[PDB]
Design a protein around this ligand. Sequence first.
Ligand SMILES: N[C@@H](CCC(=O)N[C@@H](CSCCN(CCCl)c1ccc(CCCC(=O)O)cc1)C(=O)NCC(=O)O)C(=O)O
Ligand SMILES: N[C@@H](CCC(=O)N[C@@H](CSCCN(CCCl)c1ccc(CCCC(=O)O)cc1)C(=O)NCC(=O)O)C(=O)O
Lengths: 217, 213
Amino acid sequence: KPKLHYFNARGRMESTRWLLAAAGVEFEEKFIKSAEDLDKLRNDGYLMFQQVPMVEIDGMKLVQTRAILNYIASKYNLYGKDIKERALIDMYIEGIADLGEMILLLPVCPPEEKDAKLALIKEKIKNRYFPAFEKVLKSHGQDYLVGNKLSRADIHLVELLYYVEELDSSLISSFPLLKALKTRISNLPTVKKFLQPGSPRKPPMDEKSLEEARKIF
Amino acid sequence: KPKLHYFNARGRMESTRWLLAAAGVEFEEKFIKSAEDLDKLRNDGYLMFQQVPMVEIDGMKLVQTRAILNYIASKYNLYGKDIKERALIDMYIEGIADLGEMILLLPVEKDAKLALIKEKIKNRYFPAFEKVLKSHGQDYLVGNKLSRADIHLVELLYYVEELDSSLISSFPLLKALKTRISNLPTVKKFLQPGSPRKPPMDEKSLEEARKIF
Ligand SMILES: N[C@@H](CCC(=O)N[C@@H](CSCCN(CCCl)c1ccc(CCCC(=O)O)cc1)C(=O)NCC(=O)O)C(=O)O
Ligand SMILES: N[C@@H](CCC(=O)N[C@@H](CSCCN(CCCl)c1ccc(CCCC(=O)O)cc1)C(=O)NCC(=O)O)C(=O)O
């Protein structure tokens, strides 16, 4: 079973957790608890650029978030049916990662500029990203973003919808098709199980855990 | 010809220019010069996220650097022969992308950062790739066949040279890869004068990237 090496938090590993679970793939997690736990992965030659996330899958040690996701998405037929579909998927998920990244780094952001950063994110969500995705759905009227078949684009998008909801549950209000997508995807057997309590889904970064991050890393 | 929409500068479109030319594909560039030119692309509905780079290729309008490079890489078989090779390729180029993003944003805490980038190149990135080349002793990074990994790395080797030519001294293999790749007919052509390759961003286009954006 795929072994995911990361600390006990969402961070850069959460999208992978969401994708595997959505693919109905059982995985393992080897939690880094200290800076010393990390140094060993390094000295043990497990980390190409001395960083995590690192995932042990099918005989090799993959680092770099996108390498991990691209591999899993292709293996479990969640990367579309051809080069053109992947292009759409890629364009969609890179837009999702751009927003996800901003949200992911808000708590690491220096205090004095946290307010401006959060306002900037909410503006982009309402005027740039949510409309872009709502439009995709309204254009073709299908249940999924691409090829009228479940793909990583739908998984990454809905995962983000949950983070936007925690940030401000009003942002998605004027985007019915998105709201509807979140519901459909959330009720797919695998995703519904991942969303249930006790699953490996991680909580939003709190405090004790951010302090542990700057400590380990 | 694929149509590249960006402003006359390297920025986020340079890696694409290198890839297309490496694949021997001729392209056209529609240079954005003003803030209005950028607004016209938006109003015409050509930018999914209101951003560039954006490339028109095979009938689609693709934005997002990685979406563009990924498509081009696969189309011209520069993305490995299978899923496992693509993973190695992706792992390699993403490390490259990380080091590039650092340099790409440097001009936009100056000293402290520069000294950090150099240390990472010397102690983290170059050793990682040097190690790769030594592990199999082949002319290319993956599957002993040219791939986007060779092109992006070599492109980066050039940028690192412009920054400090001494940084690649303790890495003989990276040095060698750079010479073989630069000698490939297509890459050599892109390296000679008059090619679409863009110059380092000086004071100007930095203010033009400021004005246009
Ligand atoms: N492009 C790479 C980046 C990999 C990377 O940055 N790895 C970090 C760890 S990523 C997890 C830690 N981190 C980044 C700073 Cl360390 C981080 C963790 C959690 C958050 C979340 C903050 C709260 C929130 O999510 O809102 C943000 C950053 C690492 O190993 N650093 C050590 C080193 O470089 O020497 C990839 O995507 O794999
Ligand atoms: N994830 C996307 C991001 C695309 C993106 O950032 N596009 C920018 C333009 S990227 C080119 C400009 N730029 C980034 C700030 Cl705008 C930039 C340009 C040149 C340099 C290089 C400086 C010199 C050096 O390389 O050292 C750095 C940044 C854009 O169109 N913004 C408009 C908006 O958001 O409303 C992608 O990778 O395609």
